[PDB]
Structure of amphiphysin 2:
Amino acid sequence: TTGRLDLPPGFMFKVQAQHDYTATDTDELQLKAGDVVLVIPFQNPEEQDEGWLMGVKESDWNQHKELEKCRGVFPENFTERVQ
Amino acid sequence: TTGRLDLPPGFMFKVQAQHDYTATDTDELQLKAGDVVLVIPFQNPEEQDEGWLMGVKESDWNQHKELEKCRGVFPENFTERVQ
């Protein structure tokens, strides 16, 4: 895998998981400590819960998987801002 | 199952899970939305991570399971204080 130049629409910033997170639902992102995540906006605010972000793993993004199928929510305090 | 009167040593307060949490490690507590948790102190502070609590599910406690084997850490913002 390479490094794609363009970033997802609405890209805000990059986070790295500091702790594993196991998805409990289909709309959640599964993480491993070390994963880089590209944070993007919620596409519906009524699904937005305090303490949660919406993202797409950098890995998925670089392999050009479709964004609607790969993005998911995760707890902000399992990560820290990077880059 | 009944309602035991005594509370675990160091008991601080009671929380209820607002979202499921799947343990990713043996020292973490597995929760379901609705579970009541009895919050207790960390027995070693070098294992204490910001944003995390130590607890024992009320269910386990009421069935007199051993405390050292049933307690675990969980993310504070998956819960809210009750009672």
User: Anything to note?
Assistant: Chain B has one domain: 1-83. Residues 1-83 of chain B form a domain with the SH3 type barrels. fold (CATH 2.30.30.40). Residues 13 and 39 of chain B are 5 Å apart (CA to CA).
